[PDB]
Amino acid sequence: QLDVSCFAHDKNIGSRTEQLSVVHVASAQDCMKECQALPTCSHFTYNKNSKKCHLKAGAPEFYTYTGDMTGPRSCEHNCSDACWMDGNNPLAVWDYSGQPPALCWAACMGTPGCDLYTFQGMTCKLYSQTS
Amino acid sequence: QLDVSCFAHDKNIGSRTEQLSVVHVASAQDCMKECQALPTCSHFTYNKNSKKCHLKAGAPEFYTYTGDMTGPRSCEHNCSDACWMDGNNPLAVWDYSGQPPALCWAACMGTPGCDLYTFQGMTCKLYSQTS
Ligand SMILES: OC[C@H]1O[C@@H](S)[C@H](O)[C@@H](O)[C@H]1O
Ligand SMILES: OC[C@H]1O[C@@H](S)[C@H](O)[C@@H](O)[C@H]1O
Ligand SMILES: [Cl-]
Ligand SMILES: [Cl-]
Ligand SMILES: [Cl-]
Ligand SMILES: [Cl-]
Ligand SMILES: [Cl-]
């Protein structure tokens, strides 16, 4: 089935975001499938007890409610460092271990076309904005 | 009265980047001050033995040379997440403890104008491109 392992099932995590719709289904995987059938579903809350799947467009608004679990449209969106929705290849990728952020800022200043940088871990990466 | 604490003074870090100017100065702080008086200086290398201060426009090109230290135009550029040269506050910063990065993806999808996100330390940050 669809992968539902990236979010907790047993921590009563709900989202209050306004619903696109609500449907009874027997599993988190079915809830995700219903999310994926709607072009604007970002996430869903599935309740184990009520068997209600609540599909949502907006950003999550987490809260506690018994038997809730909140998943993403797909667990495959696993980027965490610099994540462009439409994709974006870096101008440059350099090792700046032992360097302050301000030197990665300098690398960007000094690179024609650089609009922004990210500096997670040891990696100074330079980006141009999406065309 | 200029902050030179953000880079190392005693690790023999030079930069081979082509210079914009060379002067002799008494301290790393005076070298930074020289860099800040030149609109295109991105960084500098100061040598504690020769007292030579080399101001540089291009991206750093790090290498090892005894007595060298390489600082940024200013230590104030301390953004390390996703950092725009023109400034650009996040659309949102949230504590996403206990959440997968996919739910930050979801947040970006559901947030008008969000073009990219980062997810460091379980902190979801949304950004719009500047325009
Ligand atoms: O299952 C609880 C359920 O309750 C509704 S009315 C909420 O807005 C949902 O997101 C979900 O938490
Ligand atoms: O202080 C030694 C000096 O060497 C020159 S030739 C480099 O280009 C400078 O940046 C600096 O590393
Ligand atoms: Cl769990
Ligand atoms: Cl139903
Ligand atoms: Cl430029
Ligand atoms: Cl880090
Ligand atoms: Cl949009």
Swiss-Prot record, chains A, B:
Annotated a carbohydrate binding sites: 15, 56, 63, 68
Disulphide bridges, residue numbers: 6-75, 31-53, 35-41, 79-83, 104-124, 108-114
Domain PAN per the UniProt entry, residue ranges: 6-75, 79-131
Pfam families listed in its UniProt record: PAN_1, PAN_4
Highest taxon of source: Eukaryota
PROSITE patterns: PAN
Keywords from the UniProt entry: Cell adhesion, Cytoplasmic vesicle, Disulfide bond, Lectin, Repeat
GO cellular component: cytoplasmic vesicle; extracellular region; microneme
Record's subcellular location: Cytoplasmic vesicle, Secretory vesicle, Microneme
Post-translational modification: Contains six disulfide bonds.
GO MF annotation list: carbohydrate binding
UniProt GO BP: cell adhesion; proteolysis
Family membership noted in the UniProt record: Belongs to the microneme antigen family.
Complexes and interactors: Homodimer or heterodimer.
Protein's job: Galactose-binding lectin. Plays a role in adhesion to the host cell. Has a potential role in invasion of host cells.
Protein name listed in UniProt: Microneme antigen L2
